[PDB]
Amino acid sequence: YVELIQRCKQMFLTQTDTGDDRVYQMPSFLQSVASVLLYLDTVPEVYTPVLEHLVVMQIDSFPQYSPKMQLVCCRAIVKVFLALAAKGPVLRNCISTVVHQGLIRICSKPVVLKDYVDLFRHLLSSDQMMDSILADEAFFSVNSSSESLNHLLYDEFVKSVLKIVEKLDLTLEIQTVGEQENGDEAPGVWMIPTSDPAANLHPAKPKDFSAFINLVEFCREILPEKQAEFFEPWVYSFSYELILQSTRLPLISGFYKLLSITVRNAKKIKYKYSCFALFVKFGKEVAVKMKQYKDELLASCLTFLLSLPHNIIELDVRAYVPALQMAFKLGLSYTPLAEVGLNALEEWSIYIDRHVMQPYYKDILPCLDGYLKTSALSDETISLEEIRIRVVQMLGSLGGQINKNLLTVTSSDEMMKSYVAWDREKRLSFAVPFREMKPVIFLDVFLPRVTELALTASDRQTKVAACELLHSMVMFMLGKATQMPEGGQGAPPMYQLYKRTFPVLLRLACDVDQVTRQLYEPLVMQLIHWFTNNKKFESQDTVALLEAILDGIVDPVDSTLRDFCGRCIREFLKWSIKQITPQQQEKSPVNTKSLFKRLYSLALHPNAFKRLGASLAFNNIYREFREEESLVEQFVFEALVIYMESLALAHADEKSLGTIQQCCDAIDHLCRIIEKKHVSLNKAKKRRLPRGFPPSASLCLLDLVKWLLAHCGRPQKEEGVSFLINTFEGGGCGQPSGILAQPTLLYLRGPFSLQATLCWLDLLLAALECYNTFIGERTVGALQVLGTEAQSSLLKAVAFFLESIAMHDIIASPQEGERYNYSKCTVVVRIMEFTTTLLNTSPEGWKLLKKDLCNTHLMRVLVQTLCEPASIGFNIGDVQVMAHLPDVCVNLMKALKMSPYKDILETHLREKITAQSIEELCAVNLYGPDAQVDRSRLAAVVSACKQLHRAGLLHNILPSQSTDLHHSVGTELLSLVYKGIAPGDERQCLPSLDLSCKQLASGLLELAFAFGGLCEGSVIHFSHGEYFYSLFSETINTELLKNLDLAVLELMQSSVDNTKMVSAVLNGMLDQSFRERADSWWAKDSPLETKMAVLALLAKILQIDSSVFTTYISLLADTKLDLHLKGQAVTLLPFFTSLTGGSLEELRRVLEQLIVAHFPMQSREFPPGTPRFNNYVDCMKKFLDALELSQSPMLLELMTLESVYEMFRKDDPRLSFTRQSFVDRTKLNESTFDTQITKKMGYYKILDVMYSRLPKDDVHAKESKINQVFHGSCITEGNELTKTLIKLCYDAFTENMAGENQLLERRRLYHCAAYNCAISVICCVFNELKFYQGFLFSEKPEKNLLIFENLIDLKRRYNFPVEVEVPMERKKKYIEIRKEAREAANGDSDGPSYMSSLSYLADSTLSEEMSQFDFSTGVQSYSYSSQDPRPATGRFRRREQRDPTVHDDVLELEMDELNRHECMAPLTALVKHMHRSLGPPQGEEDSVPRDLPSWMKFLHGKLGNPIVPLNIRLFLAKLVINTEEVFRPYAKHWLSPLLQLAASENNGGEGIHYMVVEIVATILSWTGLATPTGVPKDEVLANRLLNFLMKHVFHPKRAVFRHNLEIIKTLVECWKDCLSIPYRLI
Amino acid sequence: AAAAAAAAAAAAAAA
8 A cells, every 4th residue: 555556556647658558547546545444534634635636537538438337436436535534624625526527628639629528528537326325425516616617717717708709800901800809799709719729628516417407416415505606606607608607507406406595585575595586587588688699699598597487487487478488499590400408498488388378478479389389390391309299288278269370479470461563563574595495584582582581490501592592683684674675664562672681691601501691792792893883773672671680689680780881881881982073972871861861760760779780880891991081071070979969868767788888889999090180170160069068967877977078079179178267167067966865756656756866967967067177176176166066056966865865765666676776775875976976086175075064974874784685685786786896985084085085984983893893703603504694794794804904994894793793603604513524504604704814914923723622423533634734734725825915934934843844834825825926925934944945844844764663754844845945946936946045055965864764755855946067967967867776777778827727726835637637639567667767757858958868868768668768758848848958968968979988889879869850850050069070070080999888888989979979960950060061071981991800899880880981971971962973982992791781690580670770761861852953853764864964873782791781771762763874773673572572581471562563563563664574574573473483472471461462463464464374283 | 460361461452
């Protein structure tokens, strides 16, 4: 269980390999270590990491499992959890969340976009087997997974859709493209996510669990909270409009059996709890919200998630006449094809029926039939039919009422509209060429087209057809309508609605065919250009066209509108194309005037929610030539403006979301170009506009007013500052109001009475007057010019007394609560808006300050932020309403600070008592269950504490409550252990009492009584473990946070004292700081261990180096010092360990220190630190060389951003699986070895020259497949390290590591080799390396004759540099040196020798062998620098034989002579490129002309081993060579097998092939050139050839297996058009 | 020599 847990790991890591290592493996580890530790309440720890990141690699890591083994897997992990129970409340949770991590990360690669799905079932499976409390398991699995998804959604995607949905528009804008993409953004997003990890893991957890956790967590005991709050937090988070959002929440909810909780109690209030209320209150906001904005993509899924919100509102349904109205229609309108919601639609039917319709059918039925009409047929003119099934099943489930609205409303659907042939007075037309019979037809092709248009099912055959001959359809109609016989004359209504079509075409073509809408857009516009340059009649027509293109929003697809202005602007393009005359500008009413004439007005008339984007993209259209085209701009300026004014204020009541002012302000974005700041242009009548605008005193002017004078007041003064005062003369009273304001309210008290001042002019007072403080004194020395209270008497003072009326309105029916609570809050907030506007603004003389009689009132309202939610608006607050509430108090109270008298603060504060805090303090702990009502006011009073913090004077509430209350939090957080576990209720209690607990007092007593205070079945085992470690290390987060904020070195105190768990304590600190900033405390940690490095660090350190008891306190300790050096090394990561820890002793050094006599952690010795200088090269070179070969087997070659980023974020300190993660995307003490070896150079391969050196140490010390690692090391590090410096550091390092040394053969091989591996891929400028080898070039001329190792590295050394040199780069660092064809060929030509007398010590090879590398390399550099003659002829006379020309001396089968000759590859590109010289430049029908001048003459391949390799050389040679250029070499080839491949016999199992394969397979490299293969010189050749070939190939199939021969049997076939006939002999 | 059986099988068969 120690070394054995090792064994576990030894499987674990080693599964990092390229081939797999199996799996059941792990759960073996699992149930194993399970029963192991279940036995142990004695705390082995230390396996915490290995067991965890172990299991996290485990559970789902698989391409598959044996389906069988998987329930076994279940018993496995579940067993882990029972252990986690006996364990005592710690590691369980964390692990769960980790598997959440990979879990969703395993979404990658998503299988709708190894594989993905598996996890589902195992998760499913995870829940379902055996016995003990599957619940809790599932429970925490859920919540932590939940909050997990929070984390990733809190990583990006919100941002994603934000930016890249908003991106191309503002990035490229030419003002031409920007406008487009603007109108393109408004109606539904670009639907483009930014980072797919966000974009998609974003789906993942949802995408995963989609069908999963719906019915999962059926559990009653553990799902009160997973219900209620656990519902919420997301639902709060929603506003960002994630597809994700609702998804499960209804699904589980309606699934959940007590919505009786929800439905009934939520009724009780409608007649936890308020959780049910909001839990309701989504409904319309949601509903509409998508109905309008969200998409068939978006909404559909969204909404449909959001219908079942009825599934829980049975009682609490009320209106929802739109619910299905938009909704279920969307079910079978746009996806009768996709049943997705459609299912739901009639589920809703089910219960809305089955729950209380008894009036509501009067509602419901007028809808049902006239809509559920398509419930029956979407079928024909799961299973669509099945739909129809359950449709009727509904129908009869009541019946007799179900009859009608289908009939009369369908009767309202225009079955009958009769138009074609201009309401059918003649033939429509016949233009088409048959005219044997000259038919007519075309009569109704149209309603057919229609029927397609609704239809996308067979759309593939059908809807396609629709637009298809729509294309020729128009041009058909107008086609014979151009001479106008009747064609147009018949048209105008006909072709009218013929336009009305194409709205649908180009509309849904989106979800269908880019090719469709995009096909017909140039056509719709080739229309709009046509008649415009023509006469205006189709103006009468396309006008109509765009008319209803007023709509397209209620029409769920709002890009319709995108069409519109885009058409419009294209309209304007054509209008810009042909603009001629204001005669024809205005008499183009379709243009110019009557455009805005309607569009503005027309915008206004319906009170059109449907102008919004139409408006923004509308004037945005102009935003290009809004600057200039001609006159109409002049009018559109003003008309545009008060159009904006009246615009806004008009609808300004019930307006659709803010989409409204999205558009409003969107055009408010233009006075910009609209202001060129001319003299008396802007300043002119256009400036006469803002004249009345603030004094318009009108409603929403706030949005407008502040807009004004900064911008539009600016042209002429500054903002227009002093234009203003001379009118204040007449009045500043011109701004405000209060007609009928205060008292009559106090009498009628009506909602109709709320409807102006109470509606707006409360606000417009506030902000309108706020913007005044700024200009001049306006709120002081301008507005107030008449009296202090005189001019504002009926205006501002009544505004006070009306805030007093708010206090009063709390002193002594949905819409009622809507504007009633919306109001009263909007009141306090906005009247406090200009309140605090003044209070803060330096124009503070107490002029309007004394003007308050609300002095005590104000403090009596704000004092309750407690009653305030329970009374005036709260629920509405979360949306950035009461979210903004805190912003008041501080802003208020501190703008009440200074000049305003402190009793405003103080007596107010004095209002507060201690009984509140001491009391609730007692109570919420005194509860257990019941924590509700107090715990609330925990949250509240804490929120007040926030307001104190930003507002100061908190202590005034806690002078001695500093002392005890904050302590008593310790009494209570203390007190919990009596009951051990605390409710998720109480789990939300704690952030309050600890959070505000420590806002004042010290976090030291924290540490002290932390340690000691924790030094203490369900009662007693729920007591047992938290005694030992957990409970405060459970609550730990906030504690740590305190320790993060203000503490410095205060750490070291209890730290050094307790010297055990503090680490862990500290550990939680570590990244809890870091993550927050990833720069703050990253020092604060550092020097406390400068000194404490001496202190708590040390007794640990040399307790390890000293050290059963002190020994495990050591493994304990050195484990720490892992942590300490590691995290502390992570705050060194900013700077240094070699100065910071380098200049600071026993920090750097403890690395080297603790190394003695321990393997398992010896793993973790190395990864920390990049120590530098002295006793490091040396002492550590010992701890690695010596302690490696000692502690690693000697045996040579015996061995074995935001979103996704967050997976590591919270596993940061720990968990060896870290990079064992993505590798998921005999050997045992050998696994001790490469355990530690992978521990070695994978970690630091990248940095330093001993980090560099040790690999070269071991590889040559003991050669293993570690060497393979070197590639993904060296080559990587070569490209990786990207330090030209350290580049050169190994350049020289290795470079004269090739100096005079005891080095061996291989010891130069991997030297230059892995050396080059890194170096060929690293920065091309190798500087004096490549130059000093120039000055080691003369090293090449040399004599060691002979000795042995002097002869060994004699030859090893001077070929050694060119070895890396010319390959790493041959070029362009080499080109100016002006040794090019000149001074090297000395050493190539000469270098390889005969050594004919050398028989010796593989001098006959290695000397001559490696000596050949002269020509090999240098000749290569020549290959690109080549003449054709030069490199070829430079080879003579041969030393041959040479080693590559000593052949069959070994290697008697043919396999690796191509693999291991280590000669080809230069020869390859050799003849390749110089054969690009001699090549398509000229071919040869002859053998010789490509050889004798070539070095292909050097190739002969006759008479012995002199045959074989040369023609082996021919192997890939002929790849390029042909044609007949290898003419005689062909004769070489059929010559080859005869007694030679025979001499090589079978020559390896695949050998016979290996020769003949292209021996003949070249024979077919031509046709007529095989006329040679048969006739001229084949004379004896192929005959014998065949004979043997056949002879052999018969058996080996007989020997081994079958179609092997057949491979030949081919060749056989391939032979014969005449040939040699050894056939009778066959 | 399995998917390679298809490889060279194709080498001849296409030849």
